[PDB]
Amino acid sequence: IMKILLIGDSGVGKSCLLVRFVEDKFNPSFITTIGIDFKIKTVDINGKKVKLQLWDTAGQERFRTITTAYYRGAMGIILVYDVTDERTFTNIKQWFKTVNEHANDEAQLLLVGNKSDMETRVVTADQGEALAKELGIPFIESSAKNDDNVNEIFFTLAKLIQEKIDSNKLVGVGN
Amino acid sequence: TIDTDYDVIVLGTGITECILSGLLSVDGKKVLHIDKQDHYGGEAASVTLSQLYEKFKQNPISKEERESKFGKDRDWNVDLIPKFLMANGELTNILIHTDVTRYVDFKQVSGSYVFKQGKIYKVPANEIEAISSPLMGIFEKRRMKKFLEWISSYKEDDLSTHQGLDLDKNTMDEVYYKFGLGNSTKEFIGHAMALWTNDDYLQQPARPSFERILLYCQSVARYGKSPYLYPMYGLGELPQGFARLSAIYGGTYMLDTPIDEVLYKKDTGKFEGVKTKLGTFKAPLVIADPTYFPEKCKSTGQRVIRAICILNHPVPNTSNADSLQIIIPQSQLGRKSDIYVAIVSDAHNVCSKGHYLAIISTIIETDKPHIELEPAFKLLGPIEEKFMGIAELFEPREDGSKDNIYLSRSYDASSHFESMTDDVKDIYFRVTGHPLVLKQR
Numbered sequence: 295i296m297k298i299l300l301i302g303d304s305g306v307g308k309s310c311l312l313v314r315f316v317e318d319k320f321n322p323s324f325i326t327t328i329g330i331d332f333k334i335k336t337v338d339i340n341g342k343k344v345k346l347q348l349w350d351t352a353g354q355e356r357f358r359t360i361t362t363a364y365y366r367g368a369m370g371i372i373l374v375y376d377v378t379d380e381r382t383f384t385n386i387k388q389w390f391k392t393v394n395e396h397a398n399d400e401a402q403l404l405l406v407g408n409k410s411d412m413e414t415r416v417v418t419a420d421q422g423e424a425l426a427k428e429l430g431i432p433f434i435e436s437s438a439k440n441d442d443n444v445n446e447i448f449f450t451l452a453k454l455i456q457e458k459i460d461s462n463k464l465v466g467v468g469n
Numbered sequence: 470t471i472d473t474d475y476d477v478i479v480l481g482t483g484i485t486e487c488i489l490s491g492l493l494s495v496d497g498k499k500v501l502h503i504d505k506q507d508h509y510g511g512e513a514a515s516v517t518l519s520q521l522y523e524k525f526k527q528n529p530i531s532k533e534e535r536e537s538k539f540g541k542d543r544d545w546n547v548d549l550i551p552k553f554l555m556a557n558g559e560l561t562n563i564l565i566h567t568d569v570t571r572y573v574d575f576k577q578v579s580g581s582y583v584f585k586q587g588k589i590y591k592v593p594a595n596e597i598e599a600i601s602s603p604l605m606g607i608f609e610k611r612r613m614k615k616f617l618e619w620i621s622s623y624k625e626d627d628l629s630t631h632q633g634l635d636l637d638k639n640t641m642d643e644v645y646y647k648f649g650l651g652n653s654t655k656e657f658i659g660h661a662m663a664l665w666t667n668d669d670y671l672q673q674p675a676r677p678s679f680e681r682i683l684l685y686c687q688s689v690a691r692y693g694k695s696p697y698l699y700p701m702y703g704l705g706e707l708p709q710g711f712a713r714l715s716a717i718y719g720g721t722y723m724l725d726t727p728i729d730e731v732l733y734k735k736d737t738g739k740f741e742g743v744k745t746k747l748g749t750f751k752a753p754l755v756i757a758d759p760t761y762f763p764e765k766c767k768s769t770g771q772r773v774i775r776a777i778c779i780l781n782h783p784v785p786n787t788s789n790a791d792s793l794q795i796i797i798p799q800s801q802l803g804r805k806s807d808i809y810v811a812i813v814s815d816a817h818n819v820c821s822k823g824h825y826l827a828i829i830s831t832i833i834e835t836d837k838p839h840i841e842l843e844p845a846f847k848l849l850g851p852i853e854e855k856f857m858g859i860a861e862l863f864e865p866r867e868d869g870s871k872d873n874i875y876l877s878r879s880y881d882a883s884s885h886f887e888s889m890t891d892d893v894k895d896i897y898f899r900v901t902g903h904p905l906v907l908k909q910r
């Protein structure tokens with residue numbers, strides 16, 4: 295079991311990425327998708343069958359009113375911005391600070407530039423890595439609409455988390 | 470930018486409002502939920518320690534002094550109003566049906582202790598404790614047991630189960646006589662199981678006392694050793710959980726957004742909308758607590774003293790229990806109202822390691838509240854710091870048909886949430902036009 299979060303400004307596509315990864319669906323409808331609490335999905339990591347527990351913000355990020363229970367015990371946190379919206383990029387530094395307070399610095403973060411399919415792009419892929427590198431976390435450029443590197447987001451994060459679990463096991467020197 | 474038209478505007482994120490907001494959103498309505506304060510919970514919020522000093526002390530200590538003595542604020546989540554959850558209560562039945570159990574974790578409360586002649590005695594949890602308790606002699610326990618068998622065996626629609634008693638016509642004292650129960654036992658059953666704050670129930674009909682006694686017993690049965698549950702991280706988790714239910718189903722949430730002006734419809738007086746620093750929002754009706762419409766609220770006459778005490782050690786004569794309720798019936802002190810104590814501790818991530826929170830509360834009946842609570846303070850031993858505060862209990866003047874301003878009641882001085890859920894069921898009907906019937910999600 296792994297509690298994974300998706301955080302970022304409203305409109306960046308957090309709920310689409312989640313729905314694409316689990317259900318393999320995209321809804322272009324301009325509405326927010328409501329009705330999503332969390333999804334479950336089994337991932338396979340080096341033989342190990344790991345269940346991801348993926349929690350939606352339910353729109354509470356919209357006025358910075360996210361519930362504490364959301365953050366608690368999160369092992370991985372996906373920070374997301376919209377490559378067509380510069381403000382959603384600028385605010386990542388702020389989200390980073392916030393998440394590191396509430397997750398209590400034990401969570402593995404990961405930066406995602408969403409809507410890489412759009413031609414109305416205003417943040418380059420290189421800009422995104424500059425910030426990712428600056429913060430000490432990996433980078434993926436995704437599109438929930440076109441399924442561009444969406445799986446890679448979740449596998450990359452799951453893999454890092456298991457790396458830390460596995461290297462913290464006490465060694466059976468005795469037997 | 471933001472929609473300005475909603476099916477319902479809800480003001481203040483107390484538990485009552487949050488439960489309403491959630492249920493309305495589940496129903497398909499479009500809720501907007503605003504709070505002037507920078508955090509969830511309203512009057513029943515759990516707050517950090519520094520905030521506890523800011524709220525109730527005249528000369529707050531330095532960060533540096535507080536932290537060496539008590540630790541960092543992130544370990545503290547201190548209830549402003551002491552409550553527990555009846556195991557088979559209605560708030561938990563809502564939690565289950567709405568799946569908000571996903572956003573909140575519960576521990577059982579270790580036990581319930583009752584006060585007598587200046588000494589606290591544990592309410593028996595099983596047969597072994599029953600047998601060894603010195604509250605009742607051998608034969609009193611038998612009658613008591615025959616009484617409790619009746620509470621279970623009683624079935625409304627079968628007269629042959631009633632043992633010759635009518636819950637409408639007979640008084641509780643008359644029921645107690647029937648079974649042969651002496652006055653100490655009456656007090657026990659009345660204040661410790663039925664959870665009355667005075668002895669008036671004795672002359673009143675049995676029905677309500679029966680129901681409450683059946684609830685106690687049913688709550689002890691469900692998971693075992695006691696009738697109470699308590700949320701990890703404090704009571705503040707409860708409203709936050711329902712806020713999320715609401716958000717999941719369509720609700721919008723704004724904190725730290727004071728209501729600059731309420732807007733009423735031209736001539737009619739009814740509710741139109743509100744005016745915030747984030748623009749202006751409209752709805753055909755509003756659900757709000759009393760601090761948003763003081764003029765549409767009247768006092769109920771009662772004022773409640775609430776004393777929050779930090780201890781360094783378990784409560785005396787409690788077998789080092791992690792959580793605890795102490796009931797001090799009024800007869801034992803010459804009062805009109807019981808005193809209550811609720812204890813929780815680091816086991817519930819409400820305070821830093823090693824500490825205990827003891828929240829004493831009662832209905833004031835003198836001009837010196839601090840003295841009224843003294844018997845309770847003696848039960849606690851060495852207290853590290855007391856946070857005192859008085860709150861007046863308001864209710865709505867009208868039911869909101871006139872104005873579509875549907876107000877909630879202030880949180881009362883009872884030890885659990887049964888009455889709060891009574892307020893929710895009520896306010897729901899007033900607003901919806903329909904009883905609250907519970908769906909599983």
Ligand SMILES: Nc1nc2c(ncn2[C@@H]2O[C@H](COP(=O)(O)OP(=O)(O)O)[C@@H](O)[C@H]2O)c(=O)[nH]1
Pocket residue numbers: 302303304305306307308309310311321322323324325326327408409410411412436437438439440
């Ligand atoms: N073109 C494009 N649009 C997207 C993508 N992901 C989301 N959207 C759209 O952007 C809007 C925001 O969706 P949502 O997942 O609710 O954003 P959220 O606030 O971050 O949860 C919706 O109208 C989506 O259809 C994407 O990868 N490409």
Ligand SMILES: [Mg+2]
Pocket residue numbers: 308309326327352353
């Ligand atoms: Mg969303």
